[PDB]
Design an enzyme around this catalytic site. Sequence first.
Site, mmCIF file in Angstrom:
data_model
loop_
_atom_site.group_PDB
_atom_site.id
_atom_site.type_symbol
_atom_site.label_atom_id
_atom_site.label_comp_id
_atom_site.label_asym_id
_atom_site.label_seq_id
_atom_site.Cartn_x
_atom_site.Cartn_y
_atom_site.Cartn_z
ATOM 1 C CG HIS A 41 14.280 1.960 -19.245
ATOM 2 N ND1 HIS A 41 13.717 1.516 -20.270
ATOM 3 C CD2 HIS A 41 13.918 3.260 -19.186
ATOM 4 C CE1 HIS A 41 13.434 2.516 -21.054
ATOM 5 N NE2 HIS A 41 13.370 3.695 -20.224
ATOM 6 N N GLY A 135 8.290 2.436 -27.384
ATOM 7 C CA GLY A 135 9.560 2.568 -28.494
ATOM 8 C C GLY A 135 10.013 3.817 -28.459
ATOM 9 C CB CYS A 137 12.630 4.584 -24.049
ATOM 10 S SG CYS A 137 11.183 4.249 -23.384
HETATM 11 C C1 LIG Z 1 10.799 -1.213 -25.232
HETATM 12 N N1 LIG Z 1 10.902 -0.281 -24.029
HETATM 13 C C2 LIG Z 1 9.556 -0.169 -23.106
HETATM 14 O O1 LIG Z 1 8.908 -1.141 -23.152
HETATM 15 C C3 LIG Z 1 9.267 1.314 -22.518
HETATM 16 O O2 LIG Z 1 8.483 0.983 -21.503
HETATM 17 C C4 LIG Z 1 9.033 1.771 -20.154
HETATM 18 C C5 LIG Z 1 8.009 2.225 -19.281
HETATM 19 C C6 LIG Z 1 7.412 3.485 -20.142
HETATM 20 O O3 LIG Z 1 6.638 3.942 -19.417
HETATM 21 N N2 LIG Z 1 7.907 4.061 -21.149
HETATM 22 C C7 LIG Z 1 7.008 4.546 -22.189
HETATM 23 C C8 LIG Z 1 7.510 5.770 -22.777
HETATM 24 N N3 LIG Z 1 6.823 6.413 -23.638
HETATM 25 C C9 LIG Z 1 5.532 6.340 -23.813
HETATM 26 C C10 LIG Z 1 4.922 5.040 -23.565
HETATM 27 C C11 LIG Z 1 3.780 4.604 -23.917
HETATM 28 C C12 LIG Z 1 3.248 3.389 -23.530
HETATM 29 C C13 LIG Z 1 4.023 2.520 -22.698
HETATM 30 C C14 LIG Z 1 5.096 2.990 -22.145
HETATM 31 C C15 LIG Z 1 5.729 4.317 -22.643
HETATM 32 C C16 LIG Z 1 6.833 1.092 -19.301
HETATM 33 C C17 LIG Z 1 6.099 1.027 -18.110
HETATM 34 O O4 LIG Z 1 6.712 1.610 -16.697
HETATM 35 C C18 LIG Z 1 8.035 2.051 -16.786
HETATM 36 C C19 LIG Z 1 8.469 2.261 -15.546
HETATM 37 C C20 LIG Z 1 9.723 2.837 -15.497
HETATM 38 C C21 LIG Z 1 10.518 3.315 -16.673
HETATM 39 CL CL1 LIG Z 1 11.971 3.992 -16.632
HETATM 40 C C22 LIG Z 1 9.851 3.112 -18.052
HETATM 41 C C23 LIG Z 1 8.654 2.530 -17.957
#
Ligand SMILES: CNC(=O)COC[C@@]1(C(=O)Nc2cncc3ccccc23)CCOc2ccc(Cl)cc21
Lengths: 297, 301
Positions: A41, A135, A137
């Site tokens: 992603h 952040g 991921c």
């Molecule tokens: C810079 N990277 C991002 O923006 C990560 O966000 C990805 C994201 C996610 O949920 N990751 C996150 C990981 N851990 C904690 C988090 C806390 C708050 C917000 C996002 C978090 C954003 C929301 O919907 C999706 C849908 C599907 C996939 Cl596969 C990912 C996501």
Amino acid sequence: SGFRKMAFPSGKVEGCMVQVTCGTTTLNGLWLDDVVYCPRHVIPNYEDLLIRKSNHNFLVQAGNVQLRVIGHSMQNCVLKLKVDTANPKTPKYKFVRIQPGQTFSVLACYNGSPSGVYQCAMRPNFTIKGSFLNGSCGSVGFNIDYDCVSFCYMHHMELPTGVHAGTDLEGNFYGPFVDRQTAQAAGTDTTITVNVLAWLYAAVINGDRWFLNRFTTTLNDFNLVAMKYNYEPLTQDHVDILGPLSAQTGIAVLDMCASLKELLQNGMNGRTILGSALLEDEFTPFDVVRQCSGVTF
Amino acid sequence: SGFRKMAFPSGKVEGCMVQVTCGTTTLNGLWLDDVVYCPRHVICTSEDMLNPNYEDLLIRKSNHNFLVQAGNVQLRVIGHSMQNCVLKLKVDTANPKTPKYKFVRIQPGQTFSVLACYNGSPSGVYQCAMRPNFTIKGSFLNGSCGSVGFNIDYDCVSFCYMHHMELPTGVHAGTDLEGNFYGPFVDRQTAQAAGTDTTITVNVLAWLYAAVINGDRWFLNRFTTTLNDFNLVAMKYNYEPLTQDHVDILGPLSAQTGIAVLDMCASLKELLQNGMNGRTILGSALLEDEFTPFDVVRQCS
Ligand SMILES: CNC(=O)COC[C@@]1(C(=O)Nc2cncc3ccccc23)CCOc2ccc(Cl)cc21
Ligand SMILES: CNC(=O)COC[C@@]1(C(=O)Nc2cncc3ccccc23)CCOc2ccc(Cl)cc21
Ligand SMILES: [Cl-]
């Protein structure tokens, strides 16, 4: 003496964490040999999105050194960025897929920098009750077997209930999740029975015996009771795996099951077990043996 | 989202663990630059432990009596000195993996990560707090002496603890990296007991703010309290007094959640009175006291 939630020493994994930036998205990558693994992603039709990217679009940073990407490919939900430099700190490793109930250590990272290490279990509903901010991921889950790191998890997302979903290092999700912003929910969770039993044995090893009773139970009667409290079924494999702990404490697995049954029907009554008022299910029988014997890495 | 007991990544400390053997006694040492730090009781026998005269025992030792092993390499001891309850073995090689570090002495209530070791090899990493009675509730077996407690704030490792002993209640006592014990403990096998432990109030308040930040508000109430009335109630539940320093320290969390410290104190008073009633706070049925205000800000934000 003492019983703590203990993670594996994270050093061998720390030397593998890198920052991966693609466009506006920055997350973590795992650098092993000449490949950087990260959630796909970071780039939805992921074949269509990936074909439009060139190597120079992916900025990989290992500390204060920019690695040069020389190739890219996708394997399920993980992106594999071929880099020119093999990680000199690459440990002996394997990619292993774990089953629900199995535990692992998570090295939570932000911007390719390790921030913390915690121990957790793959829930029966395939989520992890982790601790992750935006952040995180690409942060990975692992176990250590002698000198070998077994990578079992890569963080991809947080579900609306605050729990986490991710894949193995081959990009296959744990659970019925997809890497897309869409309506997804963690299924009804259950308690990892074999792990609660292992934790009750750890309590006995540490001097906590108040919950023991003279009673035993059949495996069928225990499973009928356990199913009523949203506890996972206890199999003969689980009984066999608890064998060493049963031999060490002199408490047969079904004898400990009768204790667990009474604990489920009657509660703790103001008492605690290993400083907890809840039955702990994130220590496997192997974790208990390892901690109550001092295995080193 | 989520709130976990989180330890610092242990890599910077793992590269400092060595095995120190003196006679029949084997424990862990911390190898920083050209010095190996370890509990001075490594020079004792199980008998010597009752009333050891460490100066007398150390003067009889020579450098070749101390066998130091870093991985599969034997380091050469070229000097030795004692600083309080820590033995400092000067070695002929500086540790190439020595991180940026400081020796810091912590106060009760402060948290730190412990890298539990056996035979100079790391076995696990866990998080714990310096209890108000100066003990730590660790997980340590025989051979764990010399295992260290630390915080890794930014790129610098702050060593705050070195393990020396297990008291009869299964709790642990040790020193800072200058060899000064935390608490009224001595490195002797004379009858010693941990004093009555108490709950770290400021840490429970910090954890209640972490719960609010994560969406848990069920325990909040419309009440406030004076600091004195809170302390009169808190001391009846064996909770540490809450000082104006603690109230000041909780200021940022109060500003972020919109709940005044004395309002959160009133929620704590009510929780102490009622229990949780089958409910949990951040997945716990007990009030957690091993997260400081700094830990909560670091993890939640
Ligand atoms: C810079 N990277 C991002 O923006 C990560 O966000 C990805 C994201 C996610 O949920 N990751 C996150 C990981 N851990 C904690 C988090 C806390 C708050 C917000 C996002 C978090 C954003 C929301 O919907 C999706 C849908 C599907 C996939 Cl596969 C990912 C996501
Ligand atoms: C290898 N062991 C040693 O060198 C000797 O052990 C030291 C010892 C000790 O308490 N260490 C231990 C540390 N942690 C956990 C333990 C669990 C079981 C048994 C011992 C433990 C032995 C007992 O009485 C004293 C008294 C005072 C001091 Cl300062 C130390 C000790
Ligand atoms: Cl402090």
